[PDB]
UniProtKB/Swiss-Prot annotation, chain A:
The lineage of its organism: Viruses, Riboviria, Orthornavirae, Pisuviricota, Pisoniviricetes. Residues 1-130 form the BetaCoV S1-CTD domain. Changing K47T: In strain: Omicron/BQ.1.1. Residues 58-93, 122-144 are annotated as: Disordered. Changing N63K: In strain: Omicron/BA.2.75, Omicron/BQ.1.1, Omicron/XBB.1.5, Omicron/EG.5.1. Changing Y56F: Decreased HLA binding to NF9 epitope. Increased binding affinity to human ACE2. It comes from the Viruses. Disulfide bonds join C83-C91. Binds to host ACE2. RBD also interacts with the N-linked glycan on 'Asn-90' of ACE2. Cleavage of S generates a polybasic C-terminal sequence on S1 that binds to host Neuropilin-1 (NRP1) and Neuropilin-2 (NRP2) receptors. Interacts with host integrin alpha-5/beta-1 (ITGA5:ITGB1) and with ACE2 in complex with integrin alpha-5/beta-1 (ITGA5:ITGB1). May interact via cytoplasmic c-terminus with M protein. May interact (via N-terminus) with host bilirubin and biliverdin, thereby preventing antibody binding to the SARS-CoV-2 spike NTD via an allosteric mechanism. This is Spike protein S1.
Length: 148, 109, 118
């Protein structure tokens, strides 16, 4: 699960950690086994014009369930109508830009993050990696292990 | 009746740099203040009140400062949408009461 | 953006008074459950007070009878009047908009210290 977040919010990706990005945007379970990795992409995703193509989530109706994709285009509001018929009050929009540009300090440099989640229920496991190809000794009494 | 005077009236600074805006009072306003940014088209928006506390969520790029009779708001790195008008509202006598400024127009290029 | 920002922090001699105020933006307060929490430096947190959307407020026991919450709904802001700050009340106070079962407390403030001379 790859994504882009603001540098100062990487500390919120943790088991049961509480905040904004981990409560309304993307929430990992409390007993989540697997690992996350994060790179300071202070070059990969930035433009002097503002690499804010991405809009993180700043308005949510209810806390997140673990791994709950919540892509939405709505208007968070307070009273009856949204801003289509109202103005000023109750015209809020959850998609806020990032504004990634190079002048930003480290704490605000777009970190690219990648999280691996290994599921182990009913596992006819098809992905390992122990192929040890040792150099076959010859002409000596040797213990061998040929395909088992 | 404390009269506040903002400065400058207008300001045009190249993109990517810092911006410093001063609003000047005539008596002791200690650390009782606020700053509103009324982007053209909707209600104003408060950025930083009192002496220097950075509003929640609000990117650290903004900075408020000053105390006594003189205060200043400062922005680290202006983005394209930061162009708006700003007003400093003081309330050292709150029980309904507030007093606004003449406003300042901040732009880009 | 939706936020809770605080003011009033400073220094006052014991037994003196102070008033903390909380202003909001992009979110309403009049129709929102408001709740003031505090933290002593280095210690945990404790629910201090709450004001509803109809006005019926509540306060923690340590500060019951001494603090009074109010809010200028007309301009979307919160207030908390305090008096008789004693040796306990030295803490950092946070403003929060709590929903409860439908989304727990989320937007918090950087905080503001309120200590006494000694």
């Amino acid at each position: 699960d790859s994504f882009v977040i603001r540098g100062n919010e990487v500390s919120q990706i943790a088991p049961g950690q509480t905040g904004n990005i981990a409560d309304y945007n993307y929430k990992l379970p409390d007993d989540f086994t697997g690992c996350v990795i994060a790179w300071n992409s202070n070059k990969l995703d930035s433009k002097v014009g503002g690499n804010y193509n991405y809009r993180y989530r700043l308005f949510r109706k209810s806390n997140l369930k673990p791994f709950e994709r919540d892509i939405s285009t709505e208007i968070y509001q307070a009273g009856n109508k949204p801003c289509n018929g109202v103005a000023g009050v109750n015209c809020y929009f959850p998609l806020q830009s990032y504004g990634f540009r190079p002048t930003y300090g480290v704490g605000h440099q777009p970190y690219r993050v990648v999280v691996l989640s290994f599921e182990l229920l009913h596992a006819p496991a098809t992905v390992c990696g122990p192929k040890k190809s040792t150099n076959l000794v010859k002409n000596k009494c040797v213990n061998f292990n040929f395909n088992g | 009746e404390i009269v506040m005077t903002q400065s400058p009236a207008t300001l045009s600074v190249s993109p990517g740099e810092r911006a410093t805006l001063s609003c000047r009072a005539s008596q002791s306003v200690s650390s009782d203040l606020a700053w509103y940014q009324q982007k053209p088209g909707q209600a104003p928006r408060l950025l930083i009140y009192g002496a220097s506390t950075r509003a929640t969520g609000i990117p650290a790029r903004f900075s408020g400062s000053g105390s006594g009779t003189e205060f200043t708001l400062t922005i680290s790195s202006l983005q394209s949408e930061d162009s708006a008008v700003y007003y400093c509202q003081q309330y050292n006598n709150w029980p309904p009461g507030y007093t606004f400024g003449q406003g300042t127009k901040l732009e880009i290029k | 953006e939706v936020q809770l920002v605080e003011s009033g922090g400073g220094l006052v001699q014991p037994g003196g008074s102070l008033r903390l105020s909380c202003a909001a933006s992009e979110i309403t307060v009049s129709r929102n459950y408001m709740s003031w929490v505090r933290q002593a430096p280095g210690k945990g947190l404790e629910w201090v007070s709450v004001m509803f959307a109809g006005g019926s407020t509540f306060y923690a026991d340590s500060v019951k009878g001494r603090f009074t919450i109010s809010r200028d709904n007309s301009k979307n802001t919160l207030y908390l009047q305090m008096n008789s700050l004693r040796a306990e009340d030295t803490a950092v106070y946070y403003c929060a908009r709590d929903l409860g079962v439908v989304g727990a407390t989320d937007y918090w403030g950087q905080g503001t210290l309120v200590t006494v001379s000694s």
